[PDB]
Amino acid sequence: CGRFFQKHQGTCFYFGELPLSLAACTKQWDVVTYLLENPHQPASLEATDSLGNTVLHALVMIADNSPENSALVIHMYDSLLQMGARLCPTVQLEDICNHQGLTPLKLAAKEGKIEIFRHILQREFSGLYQPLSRKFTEWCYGPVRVSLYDLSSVDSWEKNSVLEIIAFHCKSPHRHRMVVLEPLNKLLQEKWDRLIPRFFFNFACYLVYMIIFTIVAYHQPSTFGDSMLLLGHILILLGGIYLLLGQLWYFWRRRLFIWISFMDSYFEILFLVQALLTVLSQVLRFVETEWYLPLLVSSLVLGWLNLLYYTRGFQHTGIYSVMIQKVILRDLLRFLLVYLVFLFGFAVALVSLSREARPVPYGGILDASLELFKFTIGMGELAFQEQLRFRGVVLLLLLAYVLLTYVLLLNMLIALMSETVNSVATDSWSIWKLQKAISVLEMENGYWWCRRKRHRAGRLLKVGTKGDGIPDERWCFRVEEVNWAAWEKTL
Amino acid sequence: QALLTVLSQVLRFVETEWYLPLLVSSLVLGWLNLLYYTRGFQHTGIYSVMIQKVILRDLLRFLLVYLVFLFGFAVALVSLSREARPVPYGGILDASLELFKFTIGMGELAFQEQLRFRGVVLLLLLAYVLLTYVLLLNMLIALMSETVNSVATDSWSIWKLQKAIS
Amino acid sequence: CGRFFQKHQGTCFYFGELPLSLAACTKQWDVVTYLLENPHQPASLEATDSLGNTVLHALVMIADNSPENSALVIHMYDSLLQMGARLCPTVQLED
Numbered sequence: 211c212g213r214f215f216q217k218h219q220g221t222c223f224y225f226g227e228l229p230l231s232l233a234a235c236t237k238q239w240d241v242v243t244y245l246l247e248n249p250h251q252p253a254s255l256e257a258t259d260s261l262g263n264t265v266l267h268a269l270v271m272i273a274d275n276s277p278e279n280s281a282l283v284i285h286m287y288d289s290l291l292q293m294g295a296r297l298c299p300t301v302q303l304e305d306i307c308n309h310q311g312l313t314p315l316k317l318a319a320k321e322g323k324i325e326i327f328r329h330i331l332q333r334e335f336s337g338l339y340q341p342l343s344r345k346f347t348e349w350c351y352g353p354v355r356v357s358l359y360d361l362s363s364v365d366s367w368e369k370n371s372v373l374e375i376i377a378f379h380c381k382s383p384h385r386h387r388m389v390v391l392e393p394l395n396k397l398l399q400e401k402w403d404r405l406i407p408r409f410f411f412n413f414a415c416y417l418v419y420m421i422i423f424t425i426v427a428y429h430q431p432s433t434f435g436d437s438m439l440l441l442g443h444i445l446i447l448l449g450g451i452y453l454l455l456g457q458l459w460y461f462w463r464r465r466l467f468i469w470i471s472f473m474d475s476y477f478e479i480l481f482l483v484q485a486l487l488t489v490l491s492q493v494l495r496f497v498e499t500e501w502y503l504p505l506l507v508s509s510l511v512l513g514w515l516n517l518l519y520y521t522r523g524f525q526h527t528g529i530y531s532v533m534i535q536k537v538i539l540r541d542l543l544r545f546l547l548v549y550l551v552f553l554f555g556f557a558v559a560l561v562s563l564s565r566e567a568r569p570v571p572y573g574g575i576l577d578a579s580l581e582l583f584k585f586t587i588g589m590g591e592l593a594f595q596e597q598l599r600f601r602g603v604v605l606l607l608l609l610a611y612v613l614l615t616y617v618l619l620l621n622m623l624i625a626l627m628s629e630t631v632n633s634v635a636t637d638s639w640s641i642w643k644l645q646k647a648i649s650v651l652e653m654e655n656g657y658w659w660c661r662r663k664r665h666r667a668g669r670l671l672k673v674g675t676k677g678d679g680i681p682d683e684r685w686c687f688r689v690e691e692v693n694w695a696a697w698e699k700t701l
Numbered sequence: 702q703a704l705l706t707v708l709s710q711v712l713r714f715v716e717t718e719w720y721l722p723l724l725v726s727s728l729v730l731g732w733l734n735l736l737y738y739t740r741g742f743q744h745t746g747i748y749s750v751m752i753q754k755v756i757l758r759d760l761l762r763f764l765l766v767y768l769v770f771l772f773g774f775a776v777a778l779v780s781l782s783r784e785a786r787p788v789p790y791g792g793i794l795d796a797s798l799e800l801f802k803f804t805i806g807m808g809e810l811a812f813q814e815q816l817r818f819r820g821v822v823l824l825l826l827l828a829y830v831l832l833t834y835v836l837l838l839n840m841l842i843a844l845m846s847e848t849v850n851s852v853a854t855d856s857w858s859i860w861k862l863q864k865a866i867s
Numbered sequence: 868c869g870r871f872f873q874k875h876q877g878t879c880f881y882f883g884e885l886p887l888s889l890a891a892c893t894k895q896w897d898v899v900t901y902l903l904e905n906p907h908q909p910a911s912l913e914a915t916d917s918l919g920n921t922v923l924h925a926l927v928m929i930a931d932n933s934p935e936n937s938a939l940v941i942h943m944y945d946s947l948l949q950m951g952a953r954l955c956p957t958v959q960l961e962d
């Protein structure tokens with residue numbers, strides 16, 4: 211456990227700080243056998259390091275997304291697992307918990323590994339070493355294949371599953387491709403199909419609440435009507451506090467998720483803000499302060515815009531929302547910065563001028579900035595102000611501002627939006643798949659007041675007998691597929 | 702169009718005041734129906750097919766989001782603007798019409814000093830302008846560009862099928 | 868005409884519910900000849916199923932747009948038509 215051996219930033223190379231792990235990680239398929247079959251002092255394959263990793267953990271840590279590195283990692287992983295089958299058949303090397311509490315499959319997901327993780331998720335072996343496999347084939351009748359994928363530690367029925375690690379714990383920039391591979395993709399779609407009624411019931415309840423919000427905010431004073439108004443008032447106080455409690459529970463449960471993915475939620479912050487503003491407005495109304503209506507109407511705007519959360523759940527409109535977000539993030543803040551610099555330079559210049567008399571426009575900085583923004587809209591006034599003999603300077607400044615802003619910046623913004631939308635069309639689908647995944651994982655749990663029963667997804671299949679005694683049964687996931695390509699090579 | 706024309710002609714006999722709207726709606730629809738006979742030529746028929754595909758794909762999502770923005774901000778502006786320290790934003794229809802005027806290019810963005818909620822109204826109007834005029838319309842142009850680029854290849858075969866049906 | 872053999876949504880594989888159609892659809896160019904040239908009990912190539920499809924209908928139903936599937940389907944279609952030319956020249960299997 212040296213500094214040069216520990217995994218950190220700088221001069222380091224982590225390999226598990228064990229001779230067997232070092233031999234396995236360096237593609238030496240000559241001495242690994244001798245490290246176990248030496249009669250004088252055999253080594254234990256299930257040995258662990260100070261950090262808590264084993265040889266398989268060491269192998270998955272060194273994995274990258276490079277093709278050669280993947281070839282090495284899967285080759286050595288399979289070979290070492292096969293060797294472990296022949297040395298200690300009783301104890302399995304697959305289930306060895308780290309000090310963090312992660313198996314090799316979960317470590318492949320948290321660390322952001324995509325090539326070794328995919329192979330572990332779908333691996334097959336021949337008749338010998340059959341039990342140490344994930345994907346099985348039930349029957350190959352004709353050209354239709356029935357694949358059984360093992361759902362060990364990947365279904366959300368357990369406490370810390372792979373699906374909860376990809377969607378909440380992985381902090382890789384491009385984890386959305388991890389939730390699109392076959393096994394997981396057939397599972398998430400089925401879970402989503404099972405959860406359509408709950409999603410749309412939540413949407414309907416929120417829509418009714420927002421309609422009540424609009425009704426109470428509209429029909430309010432500058433009796434029976436007063437009774438209904440008070441009823442709606444208290445009802446919306448309760449609704450706001452309910453939303454606040456739900457969002458607070460979400461953030462308490464995901465305290466370490468905001469740092470990991472801060473632009474992947476951006477709807478829980480908005481919901482929390484809306485609920486907080488509603489509660490504050492309702493409680494502040496009692497103080498009879500004049501700043502009730504602005505808070506109420508700001509909360510109303512935010513609530514009516516929050517339906518874009520429930521926008522996703524459909525194929526096209528959710529991808530549209532994802533593209534909206536990506537356009538907002540990438541090519542809208544640079545343009546805003548440059549445009550604001552231009553605006554607040556020219557406004558100051560016009561305010562400095564225009565007091566040279568040979569109401570008056572460009573009185574203050576706010577008025578000049580507003581006029582220039584009117585130029586941006588399409589309602590700006592470009593007139594030859596003959597009142598003051600600095601006519602030419604004002605006209606030339608206005609024309610230069612128009613040329614630099616209306617012609618350059620907005621049209622170039624349209625061009626940049628076109629480029630961004632063209633570029634991110636491919637990734638837009640996978641990001642929306644990940645959004646469904648997060649929504650489904652939230653929906654498997656109940657609310658902050660009710661606990662939904664865990665509907666264990668999967669089927670118990672006769673996969674054959676374990677290596678010692680009577681048959682071993684594991685919960686698999688069935689998928690039928692038609693493939694003429696792999697059927698021609700079995701006959 | 703034919704049903705509306707027949708209904709308008711028969712309803713004229715009843716001397717009901719709702720003859721002219723039916724007649725003029727039928728007239729609009731009939732004059733737009735010539736886009737059927739548009740196809741039959743190489744370029745203009747493919748143009749019509751592209752028009753249809755643009756309408757179907759990237760015009761209903763934008764319409765949905767734009768309507769949500771519009772009818773949120775209109776309600777918010779109607780709720781405000783009665784705080785006197787005709788008056789604009791009287792009803793929901795008037796506020797929605799003003800916001801659509803913003804969409805056109807004829808919207809009025811003025812510093813209403815009549816009522817001391819000046820700042821809130823100005824900030825809501827500016828936020829609506831930023832979210833709609835700058836984001837949504839330009840992004841719509843971008844999406845139309847992407848769709849037209851994508852479906853240029855299939856546009857010819859669809860027009861061939863249209864000739865086949867004709 | 869079983870549920871697993873009928874073409875529907877779910878667990879199914881339609882092949883014409885006939886032994887000759889099954890042999891033709893599975894790329895077995897060894898037993899199709901024997902299904903017709905057995906002296907004891909020959910089979911009729913123009914046989915039809917309960918739904919009404921024949922062996923050529925069964926072949927075209929299993930066709931997809933995949934290249935390997937197309938290669939199989941056209942190969943067996945041509946071979947079976949050529950065989951039908953040499954067995955019952957009077958009656959055509961196309962119609």
Ligand SMILES: CC(C)CCC[C@@H](C)[C@H]1CC[C@H]2[C@@H]3CC=C4C[C@@H](O)CC[C@]4(C)[C@H]3CC[C@]12C
Nearest residue numbers: 508511512515518531534535538824825828832
């Ligand atoms: C509060 C009023 C006065 C000003 C507007 C501030 C709010 C509404 C702004 C700040 C950030 C903005 C959001 C940022 C993210 C997105 C992208 C997509 O998901 C739909 C629009 C949406 C959700 C925006 C809606 C408007 C928004 C929520």
Ligand SMILES: CC(C)CCC[C@@H](C)[C@H]1CC[C@H]2[C@@H]3CC=C4C[C@@H](O)CC[C@]4(C)[C@H]3CC[C@]12C
Nearest residue numbers: 726729730733734736737749750752753754756
């Ligand atoms: C009736 C008036 C008041 C409102 C307009 C409603 C009608 C005209 C709308 C509804 C659907 C629209 C049509 C939808 C399909 C197309 C695409 C292309 O083929 C030419 C335009 C055309 C034909 C549109 C013309 C206008 C249209 C026909």
